[PDB]
Write a protein that binds this ligand. Structure first.
Ligand SMILES: Nc1ncnc2c1ncn2[C@@H]1O[C@H](CO)[C@@H](O)[C@H]1O
Ligand SMILES: Nc1ncnc2c1ncn2[C@@H]1O[C@H](CO)[C@@H](O)[C@H]1O
Ligand code: NA
Ligand code: NA
Ligand code: NA
Ligand code: NA
Lengths: 115, 115
């Protein structure tokens, strides 16, 4: 199915709502349900890619688009002091949902190490 | 100057060495000098882009290339159990060096929140 077989497929098909902050033909951005910062949203491709380690060379422009969408949303949400972008792979990365997703976190000082 | 006026410009011009693990015409990957995980390396564009918030639409494919390079390096370094990718913007993101850089961390469980 367009959008894949994860939570995020359901969100892309609109079968379940999400607090959508951006949509184009390539990607969707929405607030995270378990926020770790005052602003915490996700940017996902509409194309099911299960994980970054499964992305192909021809996916570069889409992956970069996630990042540009994230920049735009961050500006729309007033993240003038900055933010952190995170992509988790696999079990050591803390990936729960096997559809690529870019986290964007801000509205507080982000610490180091990044987990 | 090609490569810009930061620490990372010096690295790109080879004026100072780094432990280089990948090089192509677009990007460079090298181990971080202050590692936060058993594997911790950086992927940078050779084009000076100061921060993600300064990237333009035409930079998408280069930004995605950083991510594909990171995937390749992670595989070369044996990160079979996964990893975390991080890009810091500005002061709240913890950005120190104003040349875009993608962190890739693995070889341990990464925690949550990501800072
Ligand atoms: N239905 C949902 N809407 C928004 N974010 C979600 C949903 N389900 C899981 N998440 C978020 O997806 C991320 C998966 O990395 C988590 O940070 C989690 O909180
Ligand atoms: N000369 C260098 N070689 C490799 N990594 C470096 C160098 N200088 C700074 N760094 C790393 O650059 C990152 C900037 O975010 C830091 O994690 C820091 O440790
Ligand atoms: Na798909
Ligand atoms: Na804080
Ligand atoms: Na340049
Ligand atoms: Na750990």
């Amino acid at each position: 199915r367009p959008g894949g077989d994860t939570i995020f497929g359901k969100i892309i098909r609109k079968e379940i709502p999400a607090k959508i902050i951006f949509e184009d033909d390539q990607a969707l951005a929405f607030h995270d349900i378990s926020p770790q910062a005052p602003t915490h949203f996700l940017v996902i491709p509409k194309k099911h890619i299960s994980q970054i380690s499964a992305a192909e060379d021809a996916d570069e422009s889409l992956l970069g688009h996630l990042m540009i969408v994230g920049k735009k949303c961050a500006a729309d949400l007033g993240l003038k002091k900055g933010y952190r972008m995170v992509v988790n792979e696999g079990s050591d990365g803390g990936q729960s949902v096997y559809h690529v997703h870019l986290h964007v976190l801000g509205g507080r000082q982000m610490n180091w190490p990044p987990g």
